[PDB]
Amino acid sequence: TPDVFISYRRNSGSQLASLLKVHLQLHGFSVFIDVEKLEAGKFEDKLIQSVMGARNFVLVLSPGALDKCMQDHDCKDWVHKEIVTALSCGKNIVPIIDGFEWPEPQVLPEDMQAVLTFNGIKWSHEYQEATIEKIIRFLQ
Amino acid sequence: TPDVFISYRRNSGSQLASLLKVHLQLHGFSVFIDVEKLEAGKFEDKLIQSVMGARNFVLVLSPGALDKCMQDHDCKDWVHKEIVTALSCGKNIVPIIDGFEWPEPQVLPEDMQAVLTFNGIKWSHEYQEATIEKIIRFLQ
Numbered sequence: 001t002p003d004v005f006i007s008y009r010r011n012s013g014s015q016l017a018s019l020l021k022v023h024l025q026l027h028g029f030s031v032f033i034d035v036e037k038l039e040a041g042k043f044e045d046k047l048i049q050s051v052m053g054a055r056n057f058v059l060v061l062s063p064g065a066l067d068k069c070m071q072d073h074d075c076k077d078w079v080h081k082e083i084v085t086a087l088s089c090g091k092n093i094v095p096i097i098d099g100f101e102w103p104e105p106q107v108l109p110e111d112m113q114a115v116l117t118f119n120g121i122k123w124s125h126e127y128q129e130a131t132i133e134k135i136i137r138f139l140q
Numbered sequence: 141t142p143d144v145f146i147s148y149r150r151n152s153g154s155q156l157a158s159l160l161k162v163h164l165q166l167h168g169f170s171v172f173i174d175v176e177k178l179e180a181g182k183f184e185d186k187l188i189q190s191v192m193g194a195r196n197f198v199l200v201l202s203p204g205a206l207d208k209c210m211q212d213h214d215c216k217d218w219v220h221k222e223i224v225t226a227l228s229c230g231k232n233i234v235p236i237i238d239g240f241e242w243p244e245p246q247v248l249p250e251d252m253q254a255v256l257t258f259n260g261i262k263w264s265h266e267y268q269e270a271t272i273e274k275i276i277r278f279l280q
C-alpha cells in the first residue's frame with residue numbers, strides 16, 4: 001500500500017509530479033502516480049482505492065490546475081474526484097503551489113471547496129532541496 | 141568539473157531540467173544546472189567555462205525552446221550562447237524532445253544550425269524509466 005498519492009494535471013503538472021515522486025522514493029516513501037502504478041482492471045474503482053490507501057495526498061497546483069473542476073457538478077473530472085475522496089477520508093492533504101492563482105472558493109463545487117483550507121508549500125526552482133525537505137516534514 | 145551541462149528554458153523546461161538532473165546525479169554523474177551550480181563572479185565567463193568543462197551537453201527542447209534564438213543575430217540569448225559554445229567545443233550534444241516542433245534550419249542563426257544534426261531522445265511521461273536509461277546510454 002502506497003504511503004503517498006500524487007494528484008496532478010497531465011498538461012501542466014506532469015514534470016513536477018514526476019520530480020516529487022523520485023525525491024519522495026529516495027527518502028523511503030512508497031508513492032502512487034497514475035502512469036506508473038495504476039494497473040489492470042476498472043480504473044475508476046482502482047483510482048479511488050489508491051487514494052483511500054495512502055495516508056498522504058500530495059496535490060500539484062500548477063497554473064490553472066483546478067479550472068476543469070469548475071462547473072463539474074456531476075463529478076466527472078478526475079482531479080475533482082481524487083480531491084473529494086481525500087477530503088471525505090480525512091487524508092493528510094499537502095498542496096504544492098507552482099504558479100497557482102488562488103480562486104474564490106465559490107467558483108469551485110461545494111464538495112471540494114475545503115481543499116483551499118489546507119496549508120500549501122511554495123515550490124522554489126532556486127531552492128528545490130529546501131522545498132523537498134519541507135514536503136518531507138509535512139508527510140506522515 | 142561537472143560531466144553534464146544542462147541547457148534549458150526557465151519558462152517551459154525548468155521542471156524537466158530539474159528532473160533530469162536528479163536522475164543523472166542518482167547514476168553518479170556530476171551535473172551543472174544554473175540555479176544550483178552557477179556561483180560567484182561574472183556569469184558570462186562562468187557560464188561559458190562550465191559549458192567548456194563538461195563532456196556532455198544535455199539540451200532540453202521543450203515547446204518553443206529555440207524561439208528566442210531566432211532573430212538573435214548578435215548572440216545575446218543565453219541558450220543560443222550555450223549551444224554555440226557546445227558546438228565549437230565538439231561536445232557530446234544530447235537533445236531531449238518534450239513536445240518540440242522541429243524548425244527548418246533557415247529560421248535559425250548560422251552559427252547554431254548544426255544543433256539540428258544531433259540525434260535526440262523523445263521524452264515519454266508513461267515510460268520515464270526507459271527514457272532515463274536511454275539517456276545514460278548516450279552519455280560519455
Ligand SMILES: C[C@@H](c1cc[n+]([C@@H]2O[C@H](COP(=O)(O)OP(=O)(O)OC[C@H]3O[C@@H](n4cnc5c4ncn4ccnc54)[C@H](O)[C@@H]3O)[C@@H](O)[C@H]2O)cc1)N(C)C(=O)NCC(F)(F)F
Pocket residue numbers: 006007008009010011033034035036038039043047068078079082266
Ligand atoms: C482516464 C485516464 C486517467 C487516469 C488517471 N487520472 C488521474 O486524474 C488526474 C489527471 O487529470 P487530467 O490532467 O485532466 O487528465 P485527463 O484529461 O483526465 O486524461 C486524459 C488521458 O486519459 C486517456 N483517455 C482519454 N479518454 C479516455 C481515456 N481513457 C479511457 N477512456 C474510456 C473512454 N474514454 C476514455 C487518454 O490516455 C488521455 O490521454 C491524475 O491525478 C490521474 O491520476 C486521470 C485520467 N486513464 C484511465 C489513463 O490515463 N490510464 C493510463 C495510465 F495508467 F497510464 F494512466
Ligand SMILES: C[C@@H](c1cc[n+]([C@@H]2O[C@H](COP(=O)(O)OP(=O)(O)OC[C@H]3O[C@@H](n4cnc5c4ncn4ccnc54)[C@H](O)[C@@H]3O)[C@@H](O)[C@H]2O)cc1)N(C)C(=O)NCC(F)(F)F
Pocket residue numbers: 126146147148149150151173174175176178179183187208218219222
Ligand atoms: C542572466 C541569468 C541567466 C543565467 C543562466 N542562463 C542560462 O540560459 C538558459 C536560460 O535561458 P532563459 O530562460 O531565457 O533565461 P532569461 O530569460 O535570460 O531570464 C532568467 C532570469 O534571469 C534574471 N535576469 C534578467 N535580466 C537580468 C537578470 N539577472 C541579472 N542581470 C543583470 C543585468 N540584467 C540582468 C531574471 O531574474 C530572469 O528571471 C539556461 O541554460 C541558463 O543556464 C540564462 C540566464 N542569470 C545570471 C541568473 O539567473 N543568475 C541566478 C542563477 F544562478 F540562479 F541562475
